[PDB]
Amino acid sequence: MQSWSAPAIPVVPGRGPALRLFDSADRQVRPVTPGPTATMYVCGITPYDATHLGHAATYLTFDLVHRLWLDAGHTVQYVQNVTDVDDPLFERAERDGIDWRTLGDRETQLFREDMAALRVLPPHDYVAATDAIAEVVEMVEKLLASGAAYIVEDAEYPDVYFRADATAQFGYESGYDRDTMLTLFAERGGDPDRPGKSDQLDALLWRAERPGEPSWPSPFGRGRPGWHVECSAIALTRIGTGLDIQGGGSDLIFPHHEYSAAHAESVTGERRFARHYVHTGMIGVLVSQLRAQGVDPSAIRLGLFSGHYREDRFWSNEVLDEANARLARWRSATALPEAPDATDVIARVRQYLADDLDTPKALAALDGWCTDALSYGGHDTESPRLVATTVDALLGVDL
Numbered sequence: 174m175q176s177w178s179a180p181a182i183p184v185v186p187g188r189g190p191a192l193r194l195f196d197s198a199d200r201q202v203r204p205v206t207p208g209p210t211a212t213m214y215v216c217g218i219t220p221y222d223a224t225h226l227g228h229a230a231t232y233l234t235f236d237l238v239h240r241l242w243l244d245a246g247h248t249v250q251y252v253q254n255v256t257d258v259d260d261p262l263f264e265r266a267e268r269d270g271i272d273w274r275t276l277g278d279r280e281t282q283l284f285r286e287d288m289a290a291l292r293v294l295p296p297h298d299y300v301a302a303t304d305a306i307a308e309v310v311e312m313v314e315k316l317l318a319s320g321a322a323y324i325v326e327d328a329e330y331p332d333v334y335f336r337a338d339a340t341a342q343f344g345y346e347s348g349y350d351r352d353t354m355l356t357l358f359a360e361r362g363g364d365p366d367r368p369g370k371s372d373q374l375d376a377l378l379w380r381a382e383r384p385g386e387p388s389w390p391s392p393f394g395r396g397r398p399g400w401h402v403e404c405s406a407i408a409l410t411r412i413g414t415g416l417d418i419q420g421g422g423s424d425l426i427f428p429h430h431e432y433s434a435a436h437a438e439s440v441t442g443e444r445r446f447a448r449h450y451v452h453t454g455m456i457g458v459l460v461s462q463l464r465a466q467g468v469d470p471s472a473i474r475l476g477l478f479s480g481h482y483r484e485d486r487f488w489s490n491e492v493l494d495e496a497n498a499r500l501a502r503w504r505s506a507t508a509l510p511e512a513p514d515a516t517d518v519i520a521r522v523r524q525y526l527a528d529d530l531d532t533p534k535a536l537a538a539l540d541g542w543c544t545d546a547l548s549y550g551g552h553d554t555e556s557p558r559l560v561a562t563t564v565d566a567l568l569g570v571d572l
């Protein structure tokens with residue numbers, strides 16, 4: 174699929190430390206050590222409604238990772254899916270009297286427009302679930318052949334399941350106990366009470382055809398993919414075994430990322446699907462609404478960057494006001510004909526961003542330089558432009 178248009182990205186002088194990030198599996202901050210091409214899969218939208226600030230905050234976090242990797246001289250392969258076949262889409266399609274395909278199309282396009290407005294770097298491979306059925310079917314074939322998967326003994330609805338015990342390491346990605354898992358599974362799309370499963374935690378790989386649902390052919394019967402195997406199959410076929418980062422919101426830690434990793438490790442025999450599992454905090458308004466109101470997308474960025482990415486945080490008009498004020502101050506200081514030398518502040522910004530994306534400290538360092546420049550001035554004629562270029566390249570903020 175078409176992704177969206179990228180902004181210009183300047184080259185920033187100097188060099189900083191390599192990125193380190195919290196890994197949900199290891200439950201600690203660890204070096205991210207990619208090859209020449211760094212690879213990241215970030216779970217995309219289910220396009221039944223508008224981009225809210227939550228989704229935005231999540232893709233903005235991964236935009237920072239992308240930008241820092243470019244700054245370090247890597248090329249990037251960023252893959253992101255669209256879950257364009259899903260129960261909530263069918264529900265909304267029925268409610269509003271819009272074809273489910275048309276709905277997914279419309280909302281994906283609005284997402285594109287929101288991302289481009291926010292100057293988020295687009296993925297290199299943007300893949301709709303409906304375009305990846307062959308890859309899912311191929312993966313499910315392999316899982317059935319190994320005995321990792323089975324077909325439930327239900328003549329009417331021969332659903333295909335992945336065994337929760339297929340991998341010895343199952344559970345390492347979330348660290349959650351079985352009781353916690355069952356509780357989350359029941360809420361997050363799982364079917365713990367479905368008759369005939371070997372284990373309540375077995376995950377649907379292929380939902381047998383139901384009357385009224387779209388379907389695709391397969392060697393194990395007509396139906397449609399389960400959720401986790403879509404992302405597993407897209408990641409494996411676009412990126413392969415050398416996956417640096419699997420990303421998304423913290424709600425995906427379990428079941429989704431757990432099963433996606435387990436499907437892949439089962440098929441490939443690799444110990445670990447992704448080198449880092451990176452999860453954003455949950456935000457508690459639509460991007461397009463704010464834009465329609467004349468809100469500067471750079472203020473949206475700064476507002477969402479004012480807290481650390483792993484923190485759950487609330488959006489409010491206070492957060493917006495603070496972001497608008499910060500944006501105005503940075504614009505003032507970087508419009509100065511001369512200002513103090515920027516070598517240290519650029520170095521600090523790189524240090525803080527490399528330390529598990531410490532945006533609050535980076536923002537504070539930049540505030541500091543701006544206040545100093547505006548209060549005492551300086552003799553570097555180049556520093557204001559260089560600070561503006563640095564904020565553009567690394568934070569995606571357009572001063």
Ligand SMILES: Nc1ncnc2c1ncn2[C@@H]1O[C@H](COS(=O)(=O)NC(=O)[C@H](N)CS)[C@@H](O)[C@H]1O
Binds near residue numbers: 220423424456457
């Ligand atoms: N309130 C929120 N705050 C921050 N991130 C969120 C929030 N709600 C959902 N997300 C994240 O934004 C995403 C897109 O969410 S979504 O539209 O519900 N889609 C899905 O969860 C997927 N289709 C995963 S394949 C994810 O990566 C998801 O974890």
Ligand SMILES: [Zn+2]
Binds near residue numbers: 216217404429
């Ligand atoms: Zn996903």
